[PDB]
Every structure is written in structure tokens, then in C-alpha cells.
Design a binder for these strands. Structure first.
Lengths: 73, 192, 124, 305, 145, 340, 125
RNA sequence: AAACUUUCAGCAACGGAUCUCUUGGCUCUCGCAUCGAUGAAGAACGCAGCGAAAUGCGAUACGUAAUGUGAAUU
RNA sequence: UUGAGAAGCUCAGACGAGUAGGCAGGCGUGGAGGUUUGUGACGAAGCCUUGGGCGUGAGCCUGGGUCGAACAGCCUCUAGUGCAGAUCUUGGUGGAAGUAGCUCUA
RNA sequence: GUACGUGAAAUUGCUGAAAGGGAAGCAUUGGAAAUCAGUCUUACCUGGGUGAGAUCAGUAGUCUCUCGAGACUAUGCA
């Protein structure tokens, strides 16, 4: 079952490399930020740290009830 | 031979050819690809190799130009092992110093024929509904007989007749709950 | 190479809706004064070679396969090496007995059938 | 026939047809005069000349159950597969309605109507590759007693196999004329009351088995106040399933002076008994109690149910 | 035989036909329109009145050349006529349909004209096919739940 | 034609059907039926082996009895019983008479042989699940048993014995050794194992170590008729996929010296060993047959259609009758007509 | 294949000859096969049907029915058999015609002419 | 709104296309040579079955005799 | 690297109105020779359909309905071979109109 | 159902839905309503256990082809 049974149009070597996301200078860790979409739209939450593209964000769960969540920048 | 054969069968008339919108096909049994091509033709290639399935076993069929005039002895076959790795080795060793295009095509057909045998075995173990053909004459008859049966049934007349009959027989308690005062009083005066 | 259609509407013959005697099969207008032949504004389009579709995706069904007409079990077995490129289409005049045999064979070959449910019932 | 001229042969037909009508009219007019003069002659003609019907000229079969009670028939039933329902035990029937694999919403719109018809019935969507016998043996441990599988293909329910649990008889019907409440003129809304059951015209012995099977799907005690009745009527081997809401009223035509009015609730459909099997349904390895032959059904006057 | 209407199921209906009748198609069409939907007893009274010129049949679609009358004010139109050939055929067909219902055992005091249609017979003048279906008035059973 | 019939509710019917009778025909003569026995479901009949002019009746509750059908009406000549500890988890699957001994095998492999004269019994354990077991009609002390996932094996009491063996010393557990064990056929063309479920066994040497070469045929739950010849090998000599439904009964027709079989799909056909094909079917049978008995030229079939159908060796519908209650077994007593 | 130019293979002419034959030709056109016992005893494969012949129906809905030939309806190429009928609306039994090729003769209505005919077609009486 | 008008769909009419059929036509080829005063071709009138707006026949009137075939005619 | 229907495969660039007229390639119909170890009473052909799909198009495939005995793909041969018009031919059927006629009328 | 195989279009009636005010039908784009189409996770890989069988036997025979190539028949399942 292993030998290719068809033309096997193997994709050409694509010269695309993964590089780190350049987030905005204003999305530093610790800055208060307003959520725009999702079930928690309109809430204000604190940016703990930046993931590769998203921001690991949370409002103090005793304050606005927004748990440890990810948010797209 | 081969070039004259191709100029006749390939471009004038072949009984094995199926003309298609994008590509012609070959209903020949010994065609590796199933397409009408110059390299795919078993008629126009005197050195040909194919893989065919015989009652659950795969065989490598080969013919050489030196047996072209003897149709009964033209094709020779070897049994290909059930181990896929060894089946590839047997194709390699039986087709030694053949063009790599022909070994490539036999190895591709071996894969597809091995897959088809796998899927066939998996369908046997599985349970699938039987396909019941629809018979036009039976459908017409039962459609017209049903219409006559429904008319002859008199459903609402028989439903009402039975409901009243069991009302008179008092299948309910002393006084019914499905009737009102006037109906019950009328029934009591009639049935008694 | 996903399937792209340059146009999905058909080309209807001019004045075919006005007259029942005039069919909608396309006919090239020959009148010199006719505005459709002159290709004015607002008039109906005409078959041009620019409307032709990609050669690679030509004849391909929306699922990427090409319909291959099948009349018996011999035709289905032909698509053993082309089950990723072609779909079996049983002919309209093949009886319900042969349709069943075709459909079981196509299932083992891994061949898509366009009309595999025609003229048959199911019973599990 | 003899005339191969189209115009002449239909001229001859019109001439003969007019001649036939005249003599029939003359015989009828003279028969009316004599029967008027002597009313006894009219009594004799009416009594002797009863119009024929397919029911009257139905072919004779000895399997028909007589109205006189039979001790052999009752001895068979008292320890039958449905005995737990018709005895003093009074096993409450629990239904499990399912469909075929990968069914469309058209099947659910009819299944919901079938769910309304039967209270204490449960619907479970068919998942994966579980078979009917596996469902039956699994449902037999969940307290269910009857399993209903609706076979549909191309967005149309066309068959229904009902299996008596745990190892009772299996019946297979092919459905037709499936109509829902919205499609029925002057329909109604069905409440939660337990419907009454009417079973008619199941004369043959094979009819008793099918009539018992359909009877076993209903709660033994109906709610009379709901005034809902479910009818399964067998006519010329066609079983018609109707559900109506009735109200007794006064009808002048009826001899008793009383007659109910009906308002359909749905669903309405027709069934043909294709096969009865001993035990859980298995189209391949099952034991055929009864299998319908379409060649024998060609006789208009031959019935099995 | 099959009629234009899905009703005429045996239980609560009765049918009557007349084919190749020697009467005008347009006059019969107008009479059919008027008596459609009426109760059977009411329709018989109305047809008798048209015979006696007490009531007028309002020619409605083929009203060209038809003189208006005050007796059409009931129907909301103006043009009206008093055909007697069309009425006689419709009265006979209604008598047949009533007799058919009596044989069927239908309730005779609830019969209404559910479907009456007039179709053009082959040109022999313009003859007319007429078919009538009278069905019981379907009442609603109270839920009481 | 005199014939006895048992039913699922234990009642015994003694029918006097005659050639040309068909209860479906309103002009036919009604058969004379003399019913006797029990009218209870728990005492339903299972098997009706015929011992010369006597009839042995097996019942669901284990009340094996014998009837003398020479006299009319038959009277209970003898009665036996089976321990309830042998029936709480097992069921009688076969019961036959040979050399004065009554085979009474169960579903779990327990064998209950029984001498009619000395009234002695001996237990005999066997292999696992059992669905068919038959004794050799001619050679004494030979058994052939098989079941679900239990390939057919031959058990022999006397090794050779060279002429015959006494009746009293049969069936001893210390003398029975298996002289043949079936070998399963090779895997299917899809490399799938051919499952084993034996549902019937018959010895076909009459229609084909002294007295070796046991020729016999078996029928399986997967509708394949297998002919075995122990001299040839443990594998079946021939295998025919004669039906797509499980096969219920198998036997020989001595009138034509030929074999018959029936399946659960209400189909009884005749298999020609010499021609290696099925020749004709016993047409007109509805509902799965429950028992078939052949006596000379007369073969009687009863089934789930609640009818008794009489055919000849050439599949001609000699007689037919309706028996109201669901039957379980059939037996042909007298092949000749009633007036004979 | 036919080689004589005195026989026509034209469908137009063969159909015209069959459907416009006189009664003498129609007598031979409606012939029936003899039963196996009569075939080996009279050394004849088939014979024209005659009244009072005892036949068995081989094909059709009435397959298996036996009876005498009550009348040979030559104008329609049909045979009328005793008690092989069909019920009508008014109760009168309308006879059913069976083609002569669909029946087999089990007993011959032997006369002097038939015996001479038998020995004429190489047949021992 | 209703009516009317218009559009679409279902059913029912009307009509007789399409398809399939075909004891007909058309065309070619082959063999043959035979009307009448011993009353021809044609026309008319009858006969008996009929459906004749057809056929057969001639007061011996569906023909009679003879040679057949051999049990129907319908 | 398999991509030799060499009549195939592949790479590149430019261009695209069109009457008369010229030149290629195709679609469809009746019949014929060959072929598909072709389709068909478990339903051929035709017809219907707001079912689905393919082709720039001529057209083709298909589901459902209806229906009841034949029919098609490919290679070649053949021709009485494709319609919206001809104040076209034959047949069928409309609006005028229940009008002219023989207040309302029958 | 003899107004008789199939039963097209033009045309007509009834019913259902929708739109209505005069160039209109029509073309382009979407909405709404109605309806329809196909696309499914299921297999693949890997490990062990249990049995199985041959294209495996430190195995015995037959048949057909050209030593060995196919087909089988016994026997064992490492």
C-alpha cells in the first residue's frame, strides 16, 4: 500500500520561513487593555504576557470575572 | 511490428478503446494504467508487464517479443508474495534491466490492487444494507390497488361505527368521560 | 487548482423567451441591424472563446472529479488507477440489477459514483 | 375486429352501443312496471342480485379465524411472545424508536409525529455502526420491550421494521402515502393523553399475529378524557394507520340516532407486510415465518392478512 | 374516472359528471362560478330562482355584452343573465350528486359544493364537460383537554 | 397416508391425509385428525424419532416417551424423564435410536444413551457447543458430532470389532475414542477464515480398520454443504455454497438414493452428488421448515406456515393440510393410501 | 441459411403468408408436439391438432391443465379445451384459447386417415 | 382587501406531435407469353354471407362435377 | 521523474472589432460495414420535470415521474441530414366574442 | 374503457401561491420565500495475547506448461 499509486504531484519547495510575530509597542505586559470581541466584549483586562501571536490576558477574577485567557492582538 | 501496430490500433480503430472527453481509455485486460497511450498499449508493446488479480492473489504478467506469434504461450505470470515489501522485490527481480517506466507502472498497479483487496476484505467484515431494486410494474400495481383498498376501507365510517359500538357496550365505567349529558342521556334511553 | 467557472448562467438564444416557437438553444444572430450581434449595451451576452474554462479544471465536477460513463462492471474496473480523478456515472438505461453489481464493485475499488442511489431501495 | 377500417368499425360500435342501451332501457322499464305491480318481485330481485365485491369473492383460505372462540388458539397465545402484555401481569410497553444510519430531517419530522402517537416511547439517533440486533439486545437490558426502526433513503421514509424484545417476532413493513399533520386538511393538535386503539379486519391467523404485535405497542389502559383514537385498519392486505380526535354527536342518518365526528391528528400512512421473522430481525440469517411473494399477490382476491 | 380535485374520497363526498353536453361553455362557466361553495339545499333554491327569473346569474368573466341588473348587487358585480339551458344541466347534475350521496350514506343536511368545474368538450358549437363534487361540511372536534 | 405430528404446545396430532387433498381448496375432503397429549407450552415437543412401528417423543421439559402407533389411538407404551440439573442450561439438540440405544445429546455436549430393554443409561461427555449429532445407521458404536465453532468429529466405541459388537457394552466412556477430527477449509479468497458452525450431519455412504472410509455430509450455518471422506483426508472432499441462509436439515432420500437439504429461508432443495448440482426444489413450501421426514417415496415437510406438505421423490405436491397450531416435528407412519 | 430462391426470407411476405393463409394451410400451421410416449410409439414428432384430441397445456397461465380439444378455431389460430375457461362478469364461462404449439398431445384421436398419415411420416402404429 | 389583470405550479380538458410498429408503397433484377363473334374488356341487374363505400358468384347465383387434403365453418 | 495517444509532453512571448468573402475544427439526425464477449420487462425508445452536472457553444450525461419493446457509444461509409420567417404547405387552437347578428331577455 | 398504445406544443377550466400604476418582457447584482445538490473519521501506524492458514515446511504426491512456472491434494502451524 506504500508505493505511490498516482502521479504524486509533490509540492515544490516553498521558501516560507516562520518568524516571530512583531506585536505593537503599546501591547506591553501589564498594560490595561479593552477586549473587543468574544463573550467578554467590553471588559478591561490586564496583559500578563505575550504568546507567539496572542496576548495571555486576564482581568483579576475577583474584579471582572475574566479568567486566564488568550486574546488575539 | 510495434510501430506499424500502433499506427493501426492507436489511430484508426481499436475495439478496446473507450473515447472520453479528456482522455481515452483501454478496456484491454492487460493494460497497466487503463488509459489509451503509446506506452500503455499491450498490443503495441512487445515487451510488456502488468499486475492482475486472480481470485484474491496478485500475479505479475510478462510477455516478450519472442513469443508474439504464439498467443497461448504469449503471457507468462509469477505469483506475487502477500508481503508487500517482497512483492516489490519480486517485481524488481523479474523485471531486471527493463525500463524504469515499466517497473514504475507495475509497482503502481500493485499498490492499487493491494488496496482494492484490502478494501474488499474490510467490506466483507462490515455489515451494509442490501440494495433492493425498485420494480416499476409492482409499484404501479400496488399504487392502484392501494387506492381501491383505501376507498373500499371506508376508514372514517368504520372508525365511527366501532366507537359507537363500544359506547353502547359500555367499555368505559358507569358514566363515560368522552360524552356529555345529552349524548349520554340519549344513549341510555336507546340502549336500555 | 480548485475549480473556477468563468460563468454559470447559460447562453440563451435572443428572443427565445418572447416566442415559444423559438428554442433557447444558442443561435448566432445573423441580422446586421440586430443590436445583439452588434453587442450594444444592456443586451444579452454571446458565447466567446474568452469564456472558456481552465484546461486543467475543464470537465471537472464541483468535487474535482470527472464523470466517466459506466454501463457494466467492466467499465467500473477501468477506474482502478484513476479513482482520484474520475467518478463513475451509471448510464440511465442500465437496469436495477446491474446497478447493484456496479455499486458494490465501485465500493471496493474506492470509486465515487454520482448516482449510486438510483432505482434501488435499502434494507439493513 | 373484423373491420380493419377505423371509421367503419367505430360507426359499427356506435350503432351496436346504441342498440345495447335501447334494449337494456326497455328491459329496465318493463321490469320496473312489473315490480311496481307486485312488490314481492322487487324483494326477490334485490335479495338474489347482490352486487359482487372483491371482499365477497375473496379466495377461500382455511386460516381465517372463526368468531366462535377456539381453545387451541387461546392455548397457543396464553404462553406466547406477547403473553406478558395480555395477561394479568400487564407489562407496560416501552418503545424505542430509531432510524437508519445518517438520516435527514425529513425522517425526523415523521419520527416526531410517530413519537406523538405513542406515549412512553423513546427516540435515539442511530450512531456509527450499531446493528439492529445489537440495538435489540442492548435495549432488552434497558427495560424496553419493542424496537421500531424507520428506514429512509434519499430523504423519504419507506420502510419500518418492528422487533418484539427480547427475542420476539420481527416484522418488516414498507410504508407509503406518508403524510404529516400540516399536510392533512382540517388537522388537529394532539395532546398528551393516551390514545385508544382500534384494530379492524385481521381475519386470518397471520393477521392475529400482526394485530397482537400492533396492540402490544399501546398502553393497556387509555385515557378516555383525551378522546384520541389510533386506528390500524387492514383492507386488501393494506394496513392504514390513522389517528383521529372524536366527539360523540347526533347523526340523523345512523339508525341509532348517534354518531361521532372525527378530526384527524396525524400522521397518516399505509403499510404492507413484507416479512415476519422468528426472533430478532436479521435479513441474512433470520428464520422466515412469512415472506410475501409478489407473484401470488397478482390475484386481486387473494389476501394473507 | 378522475376529477380535477383532490377531494371526492369516498367517505365524505359524492360526484357527478356530464360530458359532451350540448350547452355553451361560457354560460356554463358562469353558472358554475356562482353555485360553487354553496350549500346543496341553498344551491337548489338558487337554481330554481334563476329558472323563475327571481335571481340572476352574474356573468363575471365573459361579461362582454351582458346587461347589468340590480339582482347582481348581492354578488358585488353588475352584469347578469338568466340562462336556463346551463341551469337545467347543473340542476340535473346536482340531483345526480345528491342521489349519489344518499346511496353513500352521507349526512344530507351538511352537503356543500366543494368543487364544480366546466371544461371545453371537442368542437362538434362549443359543448361542455361538467363535473361536480359535493362533500360534507367538515366540523372541528373540540379538544376539551 | 398416515402420519404423526407434534406441536410447540405439546399436543400430538394423528393425521390421515390422503393423496390429492389440499385444505386450501374448498372442494377438498377434510383430513381426519386425532389429537392427544398435553396442551401446555412448557411441555412442547422437540423430536419425533420413529423406532420401527413405534414413535419416540422428546419434550422441552425432558419427558421422553414412546408411543405404539400400530394401534389406534396410540397409547403411551413407556415414559422416561431427564434430570432438571441437565436442562437448566442445556437443551436437546438431537435424539435418535440405533442398536437398541437411544441417543439423547444436549447442547453442552452431554450424551444420555439409554437401553430400551434393560432400561440402563450411561453418561458420555463430549466437546463444547453442540448443534448436530448423528449415529451411524449401519456400523454400531459410531457417533458424529459438531456445533458452533466445533468442527465435526467422529467418535467410535468399538475400534473395529470386525463383525458386530454386543448391545450391552456400547457407549462406555473408557472405550470411546475419536477416530476422525474435521480440518477447516483454507481461508477465503479475501484471506478471511471460513467460520465453522455445523448444523446437521448425515452419513452418505448408502448413496455413494474394517468399515472405515466414513462418507458423510454436513450442513453449516453459513449455507455450505460439505462432503467428507475420512480416507481422503480431514478436510472436506467437496464444498458447495448451496444457500445464502443457514441450513436447517439434511438427509437422504432412499427412493432416489439421493440427498436433500433445507434452509431457514423456507427453501427445500435436492442436491445431486454425481452431477454436483441442485436438481429441483420442493416448491410450494412457505415458512421455514421445522422438520422433514422421508419414508420410501413419501417425504413430509412441516414448517412455520402451519401446514403439512407431502411430496414425492420427484417433488410432486402429493398432499397438503392445515394444522392450526405451530408444529415442531413430522413423521410419516404409513406411505400407502388410507384405503390400502 | 436458406439457399433456394424459391423460398423468400422477406418478413413482409412471410407475415402475409401466415396471416392470409387458407384453412387447408392453417390446418398444418396449427400443429402440436406429441408426448414422449407417443413420440417413441408412433415415430412422429408432431401432428396437426384435431377435435377430440387429448392434450396437456405446457405454457401460459393454464399450464398443466388437461382436457380434450373441443374445437379447433382456425380463424384465430386457437384451440378450445374442455373446462379450460375464464369466468365472466355475468357468470357465464368464456372459453380461453391456447395456441396449438403450447400444448402437447397425450392421446391421439385415431381414425383410418390418421393411421395412414402416421405410416406416411415413417410411423409404426 | 375583493374583483379583474398578470406570472408560476398542480390537476383536469383540448389537441394529436414524438417514439415504436407495418398483410402498404417505391425501386431494381429474374422467368414466362396467355383476350375476343365458341361473344372479350367494360357496364348493368340479381344471388348470400354481410360492414360495405368490400368480396365471391350467376336462376346449378359464397357456386355444381372431378382430383384431393381429411373434421370443420365461426 | 516515470511528463513517447511524437497525432504526445513541455517552455516562452505577443496578440484578440468585424460586413462581403476565405479557411480550419467541432455538435446533431436517418440508414450501412465493423466494434463495445454493449444497454433492455429487475423496464428500450419517446415524453414531462422550479432535481443535479458537463461543454465558450452547437450539444451531451444524469435523478424523479410517465411509459411499455426495442436501443446506443466508438471507427468508417452514406444522405431526401438541422428552420422563426417564404402575404410558405397541412393540421390544431386562440383574442375578436357569446360581439355582428338570426334595454332586459330565451 | 372502443372519444381506446405512447399522449408533446398552442389553447381552455379549476385550485394554490405571488405580484399589480401604462412600453413591457429582458439583462446585471443581491435580499426574502420555496426547494435542491454533493462533501463525513476511517482508515493508517505500532505492540502484545489468543487461535487460524500458504505463496512458511532442516516436508510427501498429482496435473498442465517451459530444471522452475502456475494450479491443486494430503500432513504440520515452529
Amino acid at each position: 500500500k506504500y508505493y505511490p499509486a498516482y502521479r504524486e504531484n509533490v509540492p515544490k519547495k516553498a521558501r516560507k520561513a516562520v518568524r516571530p510575530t512583531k506585536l505593537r509597542a503599546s501591547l506591553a505586559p501589564g498594560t490595561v487593555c479593552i477586549l473587543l470581541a468574544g463573550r467578554f466584549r467590553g471588559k478591561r483586562v490586564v496583559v500578563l504576557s505575550q504568546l507567539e501571536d496572542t496576548l495571555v490576558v486576564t482581568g483579576p477574577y475577583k474584579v471582572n470575572g475574566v479568567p486566564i485567557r488568550r486574546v488575539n492582538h | 511490428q510495434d510501430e506499424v501496430i500502433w499506427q493501426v490500433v492507436g489511430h484508426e480503430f481499436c475495439s478496446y478503446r473507450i473515447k472520453g472527453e479528456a482522455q481515452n481509455f483501454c478496456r484491454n485486460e492487460y493494460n497497466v494504467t487503463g488509459l489509451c497511450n503509446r506506452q500503455s498499449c499491450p498490443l503495441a508493446n512487445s515487451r510488456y508487464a502488468t499486475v492482475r488479480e486472480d481470485n484474491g492473489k496478485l500475479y505479475l504478467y510478462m510477455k516478450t517479443i519472442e513469443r508474439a506469434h504464439f498467443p497461448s504461450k504469449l503471457w507468462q505470470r509469477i505469483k506475487l508474495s502477500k508481503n508487500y515489501a517482497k512483492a516489490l522485490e519480486q517485481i524488481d527481480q523479474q523485471l531486471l534491466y527493463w525500463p524504469g517506466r515499466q517497473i514504475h507502472r507495475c509497482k503502481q498497479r500493485l499498490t492499487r490492487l493491494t488496496q482494492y483487496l484490502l478494501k474488499a476484505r474490510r467490506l466483507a467484515l462490515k455489515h451494509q444494507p442490501a440494495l433492493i431494486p425498485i420494480k416499476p410494474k409492482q409499484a404501479h400495481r400496488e399504487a392502484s390497488r392501494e387506492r381501491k383498498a383505501l376507498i373500499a376501507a371506508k376508514l372514517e365510517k368504520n372508525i365511527e361505527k366501532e366507537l359507537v359500538k363500544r359506547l353502547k357496550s359500555g367499555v368505559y365505567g358507569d358514566q363515560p368521560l368522552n360524552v356529555n349529558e345529552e349524548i349520554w342521556n340519549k344513549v341510555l334511553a336507546a340502549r336500555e | 487548482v480548485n475549480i473556477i467557472k468563468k460563468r454559470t448562467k447559460p447562453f440563451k438564444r435572443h428572443q427565445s423567451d418572447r416566442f415559444k416557437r423559438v428554442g433557447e438553444s444558442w443561435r448566432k444572430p445573423r441580422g446586421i441591424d440586430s443590436c445583439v450581434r452588434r453587442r450594444f449595451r444592456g443586451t444579452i451576452s454571446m458565447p466567446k472563446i474568452g469564456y472558456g474554462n481552465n484546461k486543467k479544471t475543464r470537465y471537472c465536477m464541483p468535487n474535482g472529479l470527472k464523470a466517466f460513463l459506466v454501463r457494466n462492471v467492466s467499465d467500473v474496473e477501468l477506474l482502478l488507477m484513476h479513482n482520484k480523478t474520475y467518478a463513475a456515472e451509471i448510464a440511465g438505461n442500465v437496469s436495477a440489477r446491474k446497478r447493484v453489481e456496479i455499486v458494490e464493485k465501485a465500493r471496493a475499488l474506492g470509486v465515487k459514483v454520482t448516482n449510486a442511489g438510483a432505482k434501488v431501495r435499502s434494507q439493513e | 375486429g373484423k373491420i380493419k377500417n377505423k371509421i367503419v368499425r367505430q360507426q359499427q360500435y356506435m350503432k351496436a352501443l346504441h342498440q345495447k342501451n335501447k334494449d337494456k332501457l326497455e328491459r329496465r322499464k318493463e321490469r320496473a312496471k312489473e315490480e311496481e305491480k307486485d312488490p314481492e318481485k322487487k324483494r326477490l330481485r334485490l335479495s338474489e342480485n347482490i352486487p359482487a365485491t372483491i371482499e365477497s369473492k375473496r379466495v377461500y383460505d382455511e386460516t381465517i379465524i372463526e368468531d366462535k372462540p377456539d381453545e387451541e388458539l387461546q392455548a397457543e397465545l396464553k404462553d406466547d411472545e406477547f403473553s406478558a402484555y395480555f395477561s394479568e401481569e400487564r407489562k407496560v410497553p416501552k418503545l424505542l424508536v430509531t432510524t437508519s444510519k445518517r438520516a435527514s430531517r425529513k425522517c425526523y419530522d415523521f419520527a416526531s409525529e410517530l413519537l406523538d402517537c405513542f406515549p412512553n416511547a423513546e427516540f435515539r439517533k442511530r450512531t456509527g455502526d450499531i446493528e439492529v440486533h445489537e440495538i435489540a439486545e442492548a435495549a432488552a437490558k434497558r427495560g424496553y420491550t419493542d424496537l421500531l426502526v424507520l428506514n429512509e433513503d434519499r430523504k423519504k421514509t419507506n420502510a419500518l421494521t418492528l422487533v418484539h424484545l427480547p427475542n420476539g417476532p420481527s416484522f418488516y413493513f414498507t410504508l407509503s402515502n406518508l403524510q404529516t399533520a400540516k399536510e392533512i386538511s382540517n388537522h388537529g393538535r394532539s395532546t398528551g393523553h393516551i390514545p385508544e386503539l382500534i384494530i379492524n379486519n385481521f381475519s386470518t391467523r397471520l393477521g392475529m399475529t400482526v394485530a397482537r404485535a400492533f396492540q402490544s405497542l399501546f398502553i393497556q389502559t387509555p385515557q378516555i378524557q383525551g378522546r384520541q383514537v389510533v386506528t390500524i385498519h387492514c383492507q386488501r392486505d393494506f394496513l392504514f394507520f390513522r389517528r383521529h380526535r372524536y366527539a360523540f354527536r347526533e347523526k340523523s342518518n345512523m339508525p341509532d340516532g348517534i354518531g361521532t365526528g372525527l378530526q384527524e391528528l396525524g400522521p397518516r400512512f399505509t403499510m404492507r407486510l413484507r416479512m415476519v421473522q422468528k426472533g430478532v430481525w436479521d435479513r441474512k440469517e433470520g428464520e422466515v415465518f412469512f415472506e410475501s411473494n409478489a407473484g401470488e399477490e397478482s390475484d386481486r382476491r387473494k389476501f394473507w392478512l | 374516472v378522475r376529477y380535477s380535485a383532490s377531494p371526492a374520497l369516498e367517505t365524505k363526498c359524492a360526484k357527478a359528471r356530464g360530458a359532451y353536453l350540448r350547452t355553451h361553455f361560457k354560460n356554463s362557466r358562469e353558472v358554475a362560478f356562482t353555485i360553487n361553495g354553496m350549500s346543496l339545499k341553498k344551491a337548489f333554491i338558487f337554481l330554481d330562482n334563476v329558472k323563475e327569473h327571481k335571481q340572476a346569474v352574474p356573468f363575471r368573466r365573459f361579461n362582454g355584452g351582458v346587461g347589468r341588473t340590480a339582482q347582481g348587487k348581492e354578488f358585488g358585480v353588475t352584469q347578469a343573465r338568466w340562462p336556463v339551458k346551463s341551469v337545467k344541466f347543473f340542476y340535473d347534475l346536482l340531483k345526480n350528486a345528491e342521489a349519489n350521496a344518499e346511496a353513500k350514506g352521507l349526512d344530507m343536511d351538511k352537503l356543500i359544493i366543494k368543487h364544480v368545474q366546466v371544461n371545453a368538450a371537442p368542437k362538434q358549437s362549443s359543448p361542455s364537460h361538467i363535473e361536480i363534487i359535493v362533500a360534507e361540511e367538515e366540523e372541528a372536534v373540540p379538544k376539551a383537554n | 397416508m398416515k402420519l404423526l405430528l407434534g406441536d410447540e404446545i405439546g399436543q400430538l396430532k394423528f393425521i390421515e391425509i390422503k393423496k390429492g387433498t389440499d385444505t386450501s381448496n374448498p372442494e377438498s375432503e377434510a383430513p381426519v385428525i386425532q389429537k392427544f397429549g398435553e396442551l401446555d407450552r412448557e411441555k412442547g415437543v422437540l423430536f419425533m424419532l420413529k423406532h420401527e412401528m413405534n414413535v419416540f417423543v422428546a419434550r422441552k421439559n425432558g419427558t421422553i416417551e414412546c408411543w405404539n402407533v400400530n394401534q389406534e389411538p396410540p397409547i403411551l407404551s413407556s415414559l422416561w424423564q431427564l434430570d432438571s440439573s441437565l436442562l437448566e442450561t442445556a437443551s436437546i439438540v438431537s435424539m435418535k435410536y440405533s442398536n437398541g440405544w437411544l441417543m439423547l445429546a444436549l447442547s453442552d455436549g452431554n450424551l444420555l444413551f439409554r437401553h430400551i430393554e434393560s432400561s440402563k443409561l450411561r453418561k458420555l461427555q463430549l466437546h463444547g457447543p453442540l448443534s448436530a449429532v448423528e449415529l451411524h445407521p449401519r456400523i454400531p458404536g459410531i457417533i458424529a458430532a459438531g456445533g458452533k465453532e466445533n468442527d465435526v468429529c467422529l467418535y467410535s466405541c468399538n475400534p473395529t470389532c470386525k463383525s458386530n459388537i454386543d448391545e450391552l457394552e456400547l457407549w462406555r466412556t473408557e472405550n470411546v475414542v475419536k477416530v476422525f477430527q474435521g480440518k477447516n477449509v483454507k481461508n477465503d479468497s479475501l484471506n478471511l477464515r471460513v467460520r465453522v458452525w455445523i448444523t446437521g450431519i448425515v452419513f452418505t455412504e448408502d448413496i455413494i480398520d474394517e468399515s472405515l472410509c466414513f462418507h458423510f455430509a454436513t450442513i453449516t450455518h453459513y449455507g455450505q454443504l460439505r462432503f467428507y471422506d475420512t480416507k481422503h483426508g480431514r478436510r472436506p472432499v467437496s464444498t458447495f455454497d448451496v444457500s445464502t441462509s443457514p441450513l436447517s436439515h439434511v438427509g437422504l432420500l432412499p427412493s432416489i438414493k439421493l440427498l436433500y437439504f433445507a434452509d431457514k429461508r423456507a427453501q427445500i432443495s435436492i442436491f445431486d452428488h454425481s452431477k454436483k448440482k441442485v436438481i429441483g426444489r420442493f416448491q410450494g413450501v412457505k415458512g421455514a421448515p421445522s422438520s422433514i421426514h422421508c419414508l420410501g417415496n413419501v417425504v413430509a415437510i412441516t414448517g412455520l406456515d402451519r401446514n403439512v406438505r407431502i411430496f414425492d421423490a420427484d417433488r410432486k405436491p402429493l398432499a397438503n393440510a392445515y394444522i392450526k397450531a405451530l408444529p415442531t416435528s413430522i413423521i410419516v407412519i404409513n406411505e400407502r393410501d388410507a384405503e390400502i | 441459411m436458406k439457399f433456394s430462391r424459391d423460398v423468400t426470407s422477406s418478413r413482409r411476405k412471410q407475415r402475409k403468408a401466415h396471416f392470409g393463409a387458407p384453412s387447408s394451410v392453417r390446418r398444418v400451421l396449427m400443429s402440436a408436439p406429441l408426448s414422449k410416449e407417443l413420440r417413441e410409439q408412433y415415430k412422429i414428432r408432431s401432428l396437426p391438432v384435431r377435435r377430440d384430441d387429448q392434450i396437456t397445456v405446457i405454457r401460459g397461465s393454464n399450464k398443466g391443465r388437461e382436457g380434450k380439444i373441443t374445437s379447433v378455431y382456425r380463424k384465430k389460430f386457437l384451440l378450445l379445451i374442455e373446462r379450460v375457461t375464464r369466468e365472466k362478469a355475468n357468470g357465464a364461462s368464456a372459453p380461453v384459447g391456447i395456441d396449438a404449439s403450447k400444448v402437447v398431445i397425450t392421446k391421439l384421436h385415431l381414425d383410418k386417415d390418421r393411421k395412414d398419415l402416421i405410416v406416411r411420416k415413417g410411423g409404426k402404429v
